[PDB]
Amino acid sequence: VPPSLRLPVIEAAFPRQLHPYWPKLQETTRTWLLEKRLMPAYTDLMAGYYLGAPDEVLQAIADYSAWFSVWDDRHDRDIVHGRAGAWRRLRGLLHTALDSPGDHLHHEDTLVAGFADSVRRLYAFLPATWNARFARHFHTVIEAYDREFHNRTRGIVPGVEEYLELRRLTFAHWIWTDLLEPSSGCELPDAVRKHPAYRRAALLSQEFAAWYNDLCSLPKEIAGDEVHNLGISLITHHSLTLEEAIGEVRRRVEECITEFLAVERDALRFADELADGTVRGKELSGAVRANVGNMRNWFSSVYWFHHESG
Numbered sequence: 425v426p427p428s429l430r431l432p433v434i435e436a437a438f439p440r441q442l443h444p445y446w447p448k449l450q451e452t453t454r455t456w457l458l459e460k461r462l463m464p465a466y467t468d469l470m471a472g473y474y475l476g477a478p479d480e481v482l483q484a485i486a487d488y489s490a491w492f493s494v495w496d497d498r499h500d501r502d503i504v505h506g507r508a509g510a511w512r513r514l515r516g517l518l519h520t521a522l523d524s525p526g527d528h529l530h531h532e533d534t535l536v537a538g539f540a541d542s543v544r545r546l547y548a549f550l551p552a553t554w555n556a557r558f559a560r561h562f563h564t565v566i567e568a569y570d571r572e573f574h575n576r577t578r579g580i581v582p583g584v585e586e587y588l589e590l591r592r593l594t595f596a597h598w599i600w601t602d603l604l605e606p607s608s609g610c611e612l613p614d615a616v617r618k619h620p621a622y623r624r625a626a627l628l629s630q631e632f633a634a635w636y637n638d639l640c641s642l643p644k645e646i647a648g649d650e651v652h653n654l655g656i657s658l659i660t661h662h663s664l665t666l667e668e669a670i671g672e673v674r675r676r677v678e679e680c681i682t683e684f685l686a687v688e689r690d691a692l693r694f695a696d697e698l699a700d701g702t703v704r705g706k707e708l709s710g711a712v713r714a715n716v717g718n719m720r721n722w723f724s725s726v727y728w729f730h731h732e733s734g
């Protein structure tokens with residue numbers, strides 16, 4: 425790891441974890457991409473994150489994660505080609521397929537059909553109230569991708585706070601947070617997952633992942649003159665040099681880690697409180713503990729992914 429990207433606290437205090445299903449995961453996702461014609465003839469990131477997930481849940485999550493990267497690529501291609509109509513039509517179909525995936529399983533657009541299959545499968549694990557929350561969150565993600573389309577085709581660099589708000593949606597913070605719950609086998613009650621310690625631990629895990637991605641791409645994403653990156657917002661609106669922007673993003677990433685360590689303690693104290701001597705409480709306690717454990721695993725999975733992925 426180059427010194428500008430190295431984070432000793434991750435290396436020393438966040439040991440990597442790997443889900444035992446990882447070998448089958450890689451090839452089964454590749455087979456799904458081929459069968460769905462989503463790439464002409466990433467799973468490790470999920471296998472280091474959703475520890476404890478049932479094999480079938482981890483497979484559905486990995487296929488969705490692979491689909492997501494194929495969507496990011498189509499979005500980028502529509503942007504650089506100025507295909508505003510094609511993007512608008514896709515945007516509309518993803519909104520519709522999210523609410524009615526079965527209707528879109530054999531759509532002419534293979535990206536839409538692949539999306540529908542992955543969502544249909546994710547909808548099969550937990551009650552319909554979880555499905556509705558996933559859908560609510562992902563409708564918001566789609567519209568954030570539309571805002572990025574608008575910004576990038578017009579060459580607009582969002583302000584720092586504007587970007588930070590937008591990135592919580594284009595990175596899909598709340599989708600990865602939602603997916604903790606099928607991974608530990610339990611839809612959490614609103615009073616549990618909205619506990620301030622759970623909420624803050626969940627946020628910091630995703631801010632680390634998004635901002636570290638921005639750090640691992642700032643120099644390349646200048647050069648070619650991009651606009652969506654915390655470092656680019658800092659250079660453009662705060663007159664930072666590239667070196668100054670790298671240091672500022674790095675400090676913000678480092679603070680996510682030590683803020684997370686403090687709130688993790690509170691979240692695990694909350695998990696202890698949930699185990700109140702009843703079976704239901706022990707089950708909720710264990711689900712919270714598992715989910716917070718995987719919020720922690722996201723730090724190390726993301727960190728080492730950026731130094732392994734091409």
Ligand SMILES: NCCCCCC(O)(P(=O)(O)O)P(=O)(O)O
Pocket residue numbers: 469496594595633637641726729
């Ligand atoms: N966690 C590592 C995968 C995150 C990929 C993030 C992106 O898709 P990438 O930097 O790969 O293009 P985004 O469009 O949000 O910048």
Ligand SMILES: [Mg+2]
Pocket residue numbers: 496
């Ligand atoms: Mg991208």
Ligand SMILES: [Mg+2]
Pocket residue numbers: 496594
């Ligand atoms: Mg993107």
Ligand SMILES: [Mg+2]
Pocket residue numbers: 637638641
């Ligand atoms: Mg990025």
